[PDB]
Amino acid sequence: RKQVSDGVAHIHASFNNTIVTITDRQGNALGWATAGGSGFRGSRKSTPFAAQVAAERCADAVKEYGIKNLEVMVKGPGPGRESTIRALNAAGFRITNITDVTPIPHNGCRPPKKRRV
């Protein structure tokens, strides 16, 4: 319906899940898919493979604009940091730049207590 050809893959990779969002340079959301909503729950949801099909499913709800180049923004420590990026590149995508944007406070907010499991 419209045209971009130049995008950015923001991947949010937490421990429990990994959300993939495709966007233009402006930061406007073009398409998105998550692992948790691609048929993966709990123990399987938090896997690199689930992040992979997330990246794959996302490349199908965006090529309506015919993106052809993009940059990658890796946020968080979970799986699908890396495997998500791979799936994008195999789905027919030229990777321009890779950047980690995981936030690091300069020691500000006190985090939750340690879990005594």
Binding site: T47, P48, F49, Q52, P79, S83
Partner: protein
């Protein structure tokens, strides 16, 4: 196999064609040490497959085996309380063994009248890469490509 590595017994070749490979096959099909009756079923299946499917008996065998041969597989593994699935690239000798073994097993799990007819139709199906045995290779790969991340 904790300490002692080993070689492998190098069985005699198939009596009819002089093939070690088919000796690995008759043995795999063999049951209750009935060698005499095992090779009888393998040949009649090869004879059924050979006669009425373009001949080249050894080659016919390979066309079918070429199709059920698996390039990679997964090896279960238990690390930090987790049972991870590690996809391992599998070696040529066993590649044949799995290929042969799945063809034999799919043959007995079949509806036809005798093991020879079953064996023949399994080879034929495998030759056209279809049926149970080929499907066994594909599940192995679907299962492998899935855990590609941990190789």
């Amino acid at each position: 196999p904790r300490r002692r590595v080993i070689g492998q017994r190098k069985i005699l070749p198939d009596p009819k064609f002089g093939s070690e490979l088919l000796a690995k096959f008759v043995n795999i099909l063999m049951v209750d040490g009935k060698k005499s009756t095992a090779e009888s079923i393998v040949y009649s299946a090869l004879e059924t497959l050979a006669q009425r499917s373009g001949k080249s008996e050894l080659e016919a065998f390979e066309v079918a085996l070429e199709n059920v041969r698996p390039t990679v597989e997964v090896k279960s593994r238990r690390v930090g309380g987790s049972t991870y699935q590690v996809p391992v690239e599998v070696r040529p000798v066993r590649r044949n063994a799995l290929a042969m073994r799945w063809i034999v097993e799919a043959a007995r799990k079949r509806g036809d009248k005798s093991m020879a007819l079953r064996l023949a139709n399994e080879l034929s199906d495998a030759a056209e890469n279809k049926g149970t045995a080929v499907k066994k290779r594909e599940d192995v790969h679907r299962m492998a490509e899935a855990n590609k991340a941990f190789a």
